[PDB]
Amino acid sequence: HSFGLYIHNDTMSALGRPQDMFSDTAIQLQPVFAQWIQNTHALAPGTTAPGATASTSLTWGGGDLVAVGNKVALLP
Amino acid sequence: MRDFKTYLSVAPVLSTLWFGSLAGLLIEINRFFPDALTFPFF
Amino acid sequence: KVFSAHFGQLSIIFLWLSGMYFHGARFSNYEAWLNDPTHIGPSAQVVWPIVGQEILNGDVGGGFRGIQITSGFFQI
Amino acid sequence: MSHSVKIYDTCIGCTQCVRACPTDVLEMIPWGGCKAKQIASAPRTEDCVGCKRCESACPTDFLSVRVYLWHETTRSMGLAY
Amino acid sequence: SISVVIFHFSWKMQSDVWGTINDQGVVTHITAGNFAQSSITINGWLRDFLWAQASQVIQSYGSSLSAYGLFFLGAHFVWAFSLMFLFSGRGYWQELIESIVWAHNKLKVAPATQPRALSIVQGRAVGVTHYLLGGIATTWAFFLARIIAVG
Amino acid sequence: DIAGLTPCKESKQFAKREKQALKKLQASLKLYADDSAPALAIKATMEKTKKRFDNYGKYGLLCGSDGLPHLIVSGDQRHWGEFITPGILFLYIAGWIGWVGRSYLIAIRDEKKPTQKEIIIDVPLASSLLFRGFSWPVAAYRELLNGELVDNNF
Amino acid sequence: ALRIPRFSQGIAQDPTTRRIWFGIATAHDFESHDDITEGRLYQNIFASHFGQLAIIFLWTSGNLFHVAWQGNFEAWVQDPFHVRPIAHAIWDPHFGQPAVEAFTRGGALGPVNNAYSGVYQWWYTIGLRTNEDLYTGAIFLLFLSFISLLAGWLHLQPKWKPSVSWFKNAESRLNHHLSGLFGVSSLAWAGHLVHVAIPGSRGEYVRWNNFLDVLPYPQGLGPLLTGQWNLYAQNPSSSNHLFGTTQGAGTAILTILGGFHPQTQSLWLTDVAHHHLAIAFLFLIGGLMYRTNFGIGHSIKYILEAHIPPGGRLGRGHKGLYDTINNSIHFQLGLALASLGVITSLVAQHMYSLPAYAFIAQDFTTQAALYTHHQYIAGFIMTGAFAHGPIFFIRDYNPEQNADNVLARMLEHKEAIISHLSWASLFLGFHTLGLYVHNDVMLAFGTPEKQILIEPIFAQWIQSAHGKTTYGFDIPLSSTNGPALNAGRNIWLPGWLNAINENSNSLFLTIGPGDFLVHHAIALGLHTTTLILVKGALDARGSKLMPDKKDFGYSFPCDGPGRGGTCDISAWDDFYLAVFWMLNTIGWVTFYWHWKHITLWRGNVSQFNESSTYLMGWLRDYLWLNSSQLINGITPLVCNSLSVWAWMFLFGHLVWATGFMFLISWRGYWQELIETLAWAHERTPLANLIRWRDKPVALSIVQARLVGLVHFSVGYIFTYAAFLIASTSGKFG
Amino acid sequence: IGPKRGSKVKILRRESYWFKNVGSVVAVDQDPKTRYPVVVRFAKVNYANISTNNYALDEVEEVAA
Ligand code: CLA
Ligand code: CLA
Numbered sequence A: 001h002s003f004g005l006y007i008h009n010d011t012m013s014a015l016g017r018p019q020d021m022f023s024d025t026a027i028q029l030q031p032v033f034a035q036w037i038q039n040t041h042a043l044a045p046g047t048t049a050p051g052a053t054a055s056t057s058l059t060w061g062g063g064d065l066v067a068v069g070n071k072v073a074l075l076p
Numbered sequence B: 001m002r003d004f005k006t007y008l009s010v011a012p013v014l015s016t017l018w019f020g021s022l023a024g025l026l027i028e029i030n031r032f033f034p035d036a037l038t039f040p041f042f
Numbered sequence C: 001k002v003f004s005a006h007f008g009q010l011s012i013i014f015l016w017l018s019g020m021y022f023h024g025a026r027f028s029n030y031e032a033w034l035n036d037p038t039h040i041g042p043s044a045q046v047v048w049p050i051v052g053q054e055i056l057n058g059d060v061g062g063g064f065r066g067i068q069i070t071s072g073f074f075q076i
Numbered sequence D: 001m002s003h004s005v006k007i008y009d010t011c012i013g014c015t016q017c018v019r020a021c022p023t024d025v026l027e028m029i030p031w032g033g034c035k036a037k038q039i040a041s042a043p044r045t046e047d048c049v050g051c052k053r054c055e056s057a058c059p060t061d062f063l064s065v066r067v068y069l070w071h072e073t074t075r076s077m078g079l080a081y
Numbered sequence E: 001s002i003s004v005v006i007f008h009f010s011w012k013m014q015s016d017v018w019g020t021i022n023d024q025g026v027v028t029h030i031t032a033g034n035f036a037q038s039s040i041t042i043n044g045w046l047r048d049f050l051w052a053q054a055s056q057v058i059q060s061y062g063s064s065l066s067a068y069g070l071f072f073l074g075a076h077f078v079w080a081f082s083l084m085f086l087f088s089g090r091g092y093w094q095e096l097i098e099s100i101v102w103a104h105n106k107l108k109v110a111p112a113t114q115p116r117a118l119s120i121v122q123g124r125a126v127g128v129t130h131y132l133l134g135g136i137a138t139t140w141a142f143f144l145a146r147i148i149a150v151g
Numbered sequence F: 001d002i003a004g005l006t007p008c009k010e011s012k013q014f015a016k017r018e019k020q021a022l023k024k025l026q027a028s029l030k031l032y033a034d035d036s037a038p039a040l041a042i043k044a045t046m047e048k049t050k051k052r053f054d055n056y057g058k059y060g061l062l063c064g065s066d067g068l069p070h071l072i073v074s075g076d077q078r079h080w081g082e083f084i085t086p087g088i089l090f091l092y093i094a095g096w097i098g099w100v101g102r103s104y105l106i107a108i109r110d111e112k113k114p115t116q117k118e119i120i121i122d123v124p125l126a127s128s129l130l131f132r133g134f135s136w137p138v139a140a141y142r143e144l145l146n147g148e149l150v151d152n153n154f
Numbered sequence G: 001a002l003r004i005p006r007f008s009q010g011i012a013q014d015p016t017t018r019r020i021w022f023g024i025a026t027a028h029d030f031e032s033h034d035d036i037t038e039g040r041l042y043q044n045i046f047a048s049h050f051g052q053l054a055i056i057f058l059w060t061s062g063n064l065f066h067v068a069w070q071g072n073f074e075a076w077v078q079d080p081f082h083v084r085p086i087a088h089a090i091w092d093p094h095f096g097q098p099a100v101e102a103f104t105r106g107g108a109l110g111p112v113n114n115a116y117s118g119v120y121q122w123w124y125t126i127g128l129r130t131n132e133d134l135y136t137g138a139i140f141l142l143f144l145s146f147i148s149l150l151a152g153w154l155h156l157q158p159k160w161k162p163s164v165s166w167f168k169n170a171e172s173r174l175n176h177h178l179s180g181l182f183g184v185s186s187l188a189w190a191g192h193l194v195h196v197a198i199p200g201s202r203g204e205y206v207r208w209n210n211f212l213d214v215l216p217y218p219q220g221l222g223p224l225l226t227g228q229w230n231l232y233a234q235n236p237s238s239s240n241h242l243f244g245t246t247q248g249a250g251t252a253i254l255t256i257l258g259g260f261h262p263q264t265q266s267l268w269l270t271d272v273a274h275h276h277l278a279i280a281f282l283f284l285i286g287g288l289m290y291r292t293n294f295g296i297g298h299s300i301k302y303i304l305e306a307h308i309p310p311g312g313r314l315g316r317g318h319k320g321l322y323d324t325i326n327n328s329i330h331f332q333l334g335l336a337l338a339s340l341g342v343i344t345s346l347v348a349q350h351m352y353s354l355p356a357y358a359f360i361a362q363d364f365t366t367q368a369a370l371y372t373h374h375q376y377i378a379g380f381i382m383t384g385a386f387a388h389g390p391i392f393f394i395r396d397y398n399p400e401q402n403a404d405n406v407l408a409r410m411l412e413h414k415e416a417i418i419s420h421l422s423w424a425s426l427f428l429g430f431h432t433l434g435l436y437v438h439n440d441v442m443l444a445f446g447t448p449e450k451q452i453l454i455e456p457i458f459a460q461w462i463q464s465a466h467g468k469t470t471y472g473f474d475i476p477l478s479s480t481n482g483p484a485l486n487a488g489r490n491i492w493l494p495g496w497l498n499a500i501n502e503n504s505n506s507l508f509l510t511i512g513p514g515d516f517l518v519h520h521a522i523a524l525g526l527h528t529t530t531l532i533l534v535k536g537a538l539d540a541r542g543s544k545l546m547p548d549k550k551d552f553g554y555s556f557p558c559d560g561p562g563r564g565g566t567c568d569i570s571a572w573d574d575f576y577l578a579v580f581w582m583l584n585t586i587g588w589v590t591f592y593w594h595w596k597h598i599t600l601w602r603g604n605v606s607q608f609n610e611s612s613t614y615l616m617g618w619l620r621d622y623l624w625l626n627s628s629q630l631i632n633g634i635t636p637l638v639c640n641s642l643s644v645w646a647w648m649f650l651f652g653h654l655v656w657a658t659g660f661m662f663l664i665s666w667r668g669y670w671q672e673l674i675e676t677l678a679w680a681h682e683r684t685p686l687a688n689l690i691r692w693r694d695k696p697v698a699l700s701i702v703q704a705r706l707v708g709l710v711h712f713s714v715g716y717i718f719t720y721a722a723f724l725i726a727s728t729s730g731k732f733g
Numbered sequence H: 001i002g003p004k005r006g007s008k009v010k011i012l013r014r015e016s017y018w019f020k021n022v023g024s025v026v027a028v029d030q031d032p033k034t035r036y037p038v039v040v041r042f043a044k045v046n047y048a049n050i051s052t053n054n055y056a057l058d059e060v061e062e063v064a065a
């Protein structure tokens, strides 16, 4: 369940029928990951939490963007 | 203090004061003649 | 023994760091990089142009020839 | 052979020399004259595995034994289980 | 364990995250998420990774960093020297070491300090340690060469 | 002269190498040292690879296509000391590495217990059997093949 | 605890699984395993490889049978333009509907994979043409390959003798062979090409009907028997030819005349036949050289015996090398291997620059996955050659029966032999490796100059005394004239051996400092590879660490710890150890051709020039450049052109890597957790009582040195297999 | 002491580690009797940690003399 998993893809994407790969889109998962705990981390400054704009680690699901003016930094 | 028919000892790696240095003096010939690939003679 | 032959690590980590603080100092780029971050692309080490060497020393920021850094002093 | 690895030597004396090796070697069988007078190379060897712990200690001055037996039971390899 | 966890982070952290703002902050990752449908294939892991990035290691000659591409061959050699230490017998390099020792004695040049092959487990000690300082610095080079310069 | 082209006296392809490549060394319109006293591409590194002009010496030196210079050394037209001159040199230096190899060695196996005198070193480098090598005129080229290391000891 | 495996006995009642594996790998070791006698053995290899020839024709049959009804031929014989021939129809239920995508290749219907074997230009190159005219193949070869089994049995049945002592003659046989066989085996070929094929080539057909009515000429074999031969070679072929259709054909078999052509490279029609003829006297003259009863010729001892050239007065014998090469059967299968091994490459290195086929190179793929299946093998031999000549020394061989005698002395004076071998390698080692890192430290460092780069003088030299009429150059006595040949000229070296530089297919490619290294690194291979095989061999007998290493010699892998610590010190495990460098030479060598060729085709050659003189670059452009095509062939954007290949190529990287286990694992660790892992079942419900019949164990202490290998190898040899093809196919080159 | 007891002897058997080499001896056997007398000894060790072995006059080919 932890490697031949990939090998499926090759053997069946080189056979080539994506209908049935394991793609982020072919085997049933649908344009969202979101609902787990990430999305209850960047959103937690509304508990016993006091707060302070953003989260704890900007890489979390909810809100915010504007990070830096040369290149980038972290986002969801 | 050292006359004739072999002398005093020395450590495990005095080769590290023989790789480093001696050989080291040779970069010292590889900048005096900063270059080779054949060579003029004397 | 181990409480002694230990010791000579701290002392060492200590001779190390020094050649890094010295290095992160007079072999400068730190002064130059700080007024000018987002911009620079730091150095501390530089060759000496013996034999082939020099190629390794390529303009890094506050106006000098050197080899870069991926060891975040300049940032502590 | 069926266990045949030669550890023999010439002294076959066994004091501060060699003892180690699971069961296999009930020797001290004094041949009529070989110094500390105990000799040969083995007893009944159809019992135990394939060591070379056999030499490791006390001479064989030549080879020293190892696996060579081929015909190989199970009680002859830990694992018949 | 570590060597593939590394392989993970940067292919993520650049496929997404690292990239860049401009007007309307239209984000432009070091790679427009190529990850998408294409790490899932374990070839994409050299289509999209190893053969994609590393093009900076094998272009790196005549430069400034160069010492990476110029390591990346050694240490991508040293590893492919470990197998010799890993994969081999022992009374072998003995059996060999004497042929040597012989030719030695003819000129009168060897015996003193009985030259001997490697201590079964020393041999393993010179596997492993090499297989690592080989197989590792390889990427230490592979890396510093795809974040210096674009990224 | 031979398979590649001619030396430096003319070698078009070689010329282009001098120029682009190195001089793009340039490539840094400025990069500030108007007067400044460190950043030394500027002076030599080029000029030391560069003032190496239409001169490098003159060496002959064949230079193929792309004009990187090839070494024939077949003892002819000009090229003789690209192997022999630095060849006998390799020989002479080695052999006086091992002439003394077969020396701060054949001087021990004797007296009293001599069983690892060699993990320390009796005379460092040998510093006694030292010059035996330059103090090889002829030497092994006779005494090796006649006596001492004599077929007997063979 | 029962009794099974029907030949061995120690193996037969071994309660573990070894029972199995070791069964399926002692089968072919006739000499000494229960069922054997010198009478049994011999014949037990005889009706064995009558089981041979037999399996070679069920191969060839089907080779000519997935061809005749599909797999273009009444196509590709209309004109063979470099677009995708055919082998057979690929049919796997796993395939997607992109069954429609290339994979499914033009002419034919359902998907297919095209001839990369040569067959397609030799079933054709000896005539054999029309798609109504063709469908024989199996039909014969197979109404043959069954006979191949019949003797098998017939000569296995006692009565009509299977022959026992009669197996140690020589003279009689080989006095028979190198006449009866080879000679007439040629001849008869010289027969065929000429009556039925040369006509089929330049001229026109031959009709299944007539065979008398067809006459290369008007007035027959004319003189010929009339010693008058010469006037074959006048207006033989032409050049304004249009290959296969006469018109500028002419009809006078035999020549050495005309030569190359943009329309087909390949040896001329005739010449491969006067030759096949020409040699067929010499072997026939050779056959008839030894006894065979009548009372002429020779006894195969008495011209060894005290023959000897530099013997005579140099105290160095020659006793019955005959009754030891003859009483050996391993000496036999190892002078057999090699010759074959040396010539398997002479085949496959001459098969380029001189391919003898109608459209081949100027094909440039089939041409590059066919030099190598003849470089792999060939290397793969050599080893086995060297490996049955370190079995002779243990099972057979006989110190008291061979001594003072020149096969000994070879043993006796051995410590030198490996040393003056090892001295070659260590020299050929660091000295190639100085030149290649230095060559790579200098680039990167910015200085393409300073690059150390020796012209391959003694190379190109051989060729400016041939035809490499490259940009002039005298050479003292030669000049490019004054003296030319004088003794030779317009006979012999006509247009042929006159390809010169020919940037396209000149035979000889124009060699520079890139080639003065690989060429010293193929040299560091067979040297190192052989210091180990020479050594491996030169004491399967024993040595200091293991003195009495025998009665079993070969595969006794391992010994107890202590003494110094003792290991892969069976002549097998040096063979075992050898096969890595036969897999590293036969890599540097093949690697080399291709890069060269590649570049020397749909593009440059400067490429290999300043970018093979170093090392990084051998990885970058080649290795890294020229894979492109294949890997973005599974592509996140659907299955494109190739998909078999790249999946093979990663199947390539796995089978390989998964060698290592076997190779850094060593039975000890594996067995032990199987000791814990066989406390499971026994202690777990819904899987108790349930008995194995073979006791769970971990692999033998020789076995896994093999299996990691026989694993290391396919991966490796299945990777280049998929690599080159997956890149010499688009190309470009 | 009068003839030669143990003053210099080669080894010739080809199994014995220091075989063709000549090291020194000790208390060579006295009596008519057995077949493995003679201790020998030399500086150079061998494949075991301890190496000081006993060979026997049916042989010691010393040889010249
Ligand atoms: C003093 C030195 C000495 C001498 C005279 C020799 C001589 C020889 N060696 Mg050798 N060797 C040496 C040291 C020496 N070795 C050492 C230290 C090693 C490492 C184990 C080896 C490993 C070795 C191998 C594997 C082989 C030889 C072989 C040979 C023979 C072929 C020459 C060759 O191509 O190898 C070139 C020489 C080397 C690779 C040796 C490197 C070590 C050198 C640099 C020692 C330098 C002096 C050293 C620092 C001593 C200290 C000086 C002291 C007076 C203070 C030749 C008889 C080959 C053979 O058996 O064929 C006849 C065989 O291939 N040698
Ligand atoms: C392990 C490998 C093995 C394999 C799988 C192959 C496979 C192949 N080899 Mg090959 N080869 C090998 C080992 C192998 N070879 C070795 C060891 C050698 C060196 C001896 C060669 C030397 C070799 C050459 C020179 C050629 C090949 C060719 C080929 C290809 C042609 C197909 C074929 O062989 O039909 C085999 C056909 C037959 C077995 C039937 C023909 C045999 C004739 C000569 C029998 C004559 C007997 C006759 C009846 C007697 C007449 C008597 C009477 C009528 C008067 C095929 C890819 C050819 C090629 O290049 O393709 C492009 C060719 O060039 N090989």
Ligand code: CLA
Binding pocket: G024, G025, G026, G027, G028, G029, G030, G333, G337, G380, G381, G382, G383, G384, G385, G387, G391, G554, G555, G572, G706, G710, G714
């Ligand atoms: C043309 C051939 C020739 C002939 C006539 C023989 C004949 C013989 N060889 Mg031999 N050999 C050869 C070439 C030959 N060899 C070559 C070229 C090599 C190495 C290059 C060897 C290496 C070799 C070894 C190590 C041994 C023999 C042995 C023998 C004897 C027993 C055969 C055996 O053990 O197979 C039985 C084997 C099997 C039933 C199959 C197991 C084989 C495995 C390793 C598969 C090999 C790889 C495979 C193709 C990959 C799997 C396919 C994949 C697509 C799934 C027999 C006298 C043995 C012997 O008696 O020596 C004392 C043994 O020691 N040979």
Ligand code: CLA
Binding pocket: E077, E080, E081, E082, E083, E084, E087, E088, E096, G422, G425, G426, G427, G428, G429, G430, G431, G433, G524, G528, G531, G532, G577, G578, G580
């Ligand atoms: C790329 C690989 C690696 C390297 C460098 C070597 C090198 C060598 N192998 Mg080898 N081998 C390997 C992988 C390697 N192997 C693998 C994977 C296998 C199969 C598992 C084998 C199986 C094998 C066998 C059976 C044999 C060898 C032998 C040899 C030696 C042959 C002599 C020679 O080629 O020139 C000499 C060596 C080189 C050119 C390599 C470089 C060594 C020097 C230049 C070291 C550099 C010094 C450096 C600056 C100092 C750094 C050290 C430290 C102070 C930091 C050589 C030492 C043979 C042998 O023993 O010869 C006598 C033979 O026994 N190998």
Ligand code: CLA
Binding pocket: A003, A004, A007, G654, G657, G658, G659, G660, G661, G664, G665
């Ligand atoms: C690429 C690798 C190869 C493979 C496949 C394996 C696999 C394994 N190693 Mg391993 N190993 C390897 C190379 C490999 N190793 C090397 C090179 C080394 C050292 C150099 C080691 C050192 C090592 C150690 C020390 C250990 C292992 C262990 C294991 C097992 C871990 C449990 C597991 O997940 O297995 C099952 C899963 C796989 C093998 C991967 C999936 C395979 C795919 C292709 C599916 C194929 C199945 C399918 C039905 C095929 C049938 C089709 C038909 C045509 C046959 C596993 C069997 C350990 C163990 O036994 O713990 C349980 C133990 O810790 N290995």
Ligand SMILES: CCCCCCCCCCCCO[C@H]1O[C@H](CO)[C@@H](O[C@H]2O[C@H](CO)[C@@H](O)[C@H](O)[C@H]2O)[C@H](O)[C@H]1O
Binding pocket: A065, A066, E024, E025, E026, E027
């Ligand atoms: C990358 C694949 C797209 C999938 C996720 C898309 C969902 C969210 C929309 C875009 C996400 C990026 O967020 C980005 O939005 C805008 C880009 O139009 C930018 O908008 C920014 O520029 C302008 C300048 O005043 C104003 O319109 C906004 O006040 C300001 O936040 C911001 O730099 C950033 O907040």
Ligand SMILES: CC1=C(C/C=C(\C)CCC[C@H](C)CCC[C@@H](C)CCCC(C)C)C(=O)c2ccccc2C1=O
Binding pocket: B015, E084, E085, E086, E087, E088, E089, E090, E093, E116, E117, E118, E119, E120, E122, E123, E124
């Ligand atoms: C190659 C190999 C060897 C042979 C490797 C050897 C003999 C390495 C040892 C070489 C030493 C380090 C050379 C030392 C010589 C110099 C230090 C002396 C000169 C001093 C300098 C100035 C040069 C083994 O002994 C071995 C043992 C067990 C498993 C695998 C293997 C294995 O794979």
Ligand SMILES: CC1=C(C/C=C(\C)CCC[C@H](C)CCC[C@@H](C)CCCC(C)C)C(=O)c2ccccc2C1=O
Binding pocket: G024, G661, G662, G663, G665, G666, G667, G668, G670, G671, G697, G698, G699, G700, G701, G704, G705
């Ligand atoms: C994994 C492993 C084992 C364990 C043994 C195992 C894992 C056997 C497992 C059987 C596999 C799953 C069979 C699959 C093979 C198929 C291709 C079928 C073979 C068919 C044959 C008859 C050809 C060892 O015993 C061993 C011994 C010595 C060195 C290294 C190792 C080692 O690496």
Ligand code: SF4
Binding pocket: D007, D008, D009, D010, D011, D012, D013, D014, D017, D018, D038, D039, D040, D057, D058, D059, D060
């Ligand atoms: S101790 Fe070793 S006789 Fe001596 S070598 Fe034989 S068992 Fe006893």
Ligand code: SF4
Binding pocket: D020, D021, D022, D023, D024, D025, D045, D048, D049, D050, D051, D052, D053, D054, D055, D065
């Ligand atoms: S050496 Fe053999 S016989 Fe002796 S104890 Fe070990 S296994 Fe038993």
